[PDB]
Ligand binder design. Structure first.
Ligand SMILES: NC(=O)c1ccc[n+]([C@@H]2O[C@H](COP(=O)([O-])OP(=O)(O)OC[C@H]3O[C@@H](n4cnc5c(N)ncnc54)[C@H](OP(=O)(O)O)[C@@H]3O)[C@@H](O)[C@H]2O)c1
Ligand SMILES: Cc1nc(N)nc2[nH]cc(CCc3ccc(C(=O)N[C@@H](CCC(=O)O)C(=O)O)cc3)c12
Length: 205
């Protein structure tokens, strides 16, 4: 069902809040630009065939402006145990995280003109929970928002806290840029009265 590592990408407050009222209680144009660049990036040589995957829960799928669904240049897969007959000219649907992985590994591969590069779990507290339990998840691309904004949905596992400090390690910034390709902003970024920062955390499998 799985060969490649999974990577989770999330934007969260220091209180682990990730959403409110089914939206994102923060408008950060540069933060979204980073999300797009990371989830889309593939090495030059492999730029011909290779392509990244973004897995998301239904509710997170709905949260994306119709203007941006599907995420261009990336294989989208919406996890949902209930079929509501909506595909929309591509969009794969999967019963579960592991079901989605086998669908992809099946759909693509040898007889495939398009190959898979990286797989990103982009969200939903529910899908985040499942991913944190998955034996192939070894990387978290986190954007820390330094402000206790009000949220009603939170990240399931406190990976930045001491209790998890022997498992999850924060990577050097230079290594972040390397894995990500281009140079990324170092230190806190201010935009709309919000100060945030990019961090990459890894786990040994
Ligand atoms: N800060 C961030 O980076 C970030 C990222 C993602 C989402 N969010 C926010 O989170 C909120 C959405 O809440 P949410 O946590 O409910 O979204 P979610 O986890 O993405 O969506 C859950 C829904 O997705 C499907 N799903 C997710 N995990 C599943 C699993 N493990 N097995 C089977 N089905 C699964 C479901 O299908 P069914 O409906 O058929 O049951 C379920 O109702 C919004 O406010 C959104 O903007 C923030
Ligand atoms: C916002 C955000 N930031 C980070 N760092 N991780 C995250 N993981 C999951 C989400 C969920 C929300 C989310 C994701 C993508 C778009 C979106 O429309 N993206 C377009 C960008 C359009 C643009 O440049 O405005 C895309 O192409 O990726 C909107 C909301 C998220």
């Amino acid at each position: 069902n799985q060969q490649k590592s999974l990577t989770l990408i999330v934007a969260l407050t220091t209180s682990y809040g990730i959403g409110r009222s089914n939206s994102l209680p923060w408008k950060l144009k540069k933060e979204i630009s980073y999300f797009k660049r990371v989830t889309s990036f593939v090495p030059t040589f492999d730029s011909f065939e290779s392509m990244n995957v973004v897995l998301m829960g239904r509710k997170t799928w709905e949260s994306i402006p119709l203007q941006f669904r599907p995420l261009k240049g990336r294989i989208n897969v919406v996890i949902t145990r209930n079929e509501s007959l909506d595909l929309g000219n591509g969009i794969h649907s999967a019963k579960s995280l592991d079901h989605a992985l086998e669908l992809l590994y099946r759909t693509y591969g040898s007889e495939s003109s398009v190959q898979i590069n990286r797989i990103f779990v982009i969200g939903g507290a529910q899908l985040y929970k499942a991913a944190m339990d998955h034996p192939k998840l070894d990387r978290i691309m986190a954007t820390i928002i330094y402000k206790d904004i009000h949220c009603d949905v939170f990240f399931p596992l406190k990976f930045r806290d001491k209790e998890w400090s022997s498992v999850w390690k924060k990577e050097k910034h230079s290594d972040l840029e390397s894995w990500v390709g281009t140079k990324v902003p170092h230190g806190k970024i201010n935009e709309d009265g919000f100060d945030y920062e990019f961090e990459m955390w890894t786990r040994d499998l």
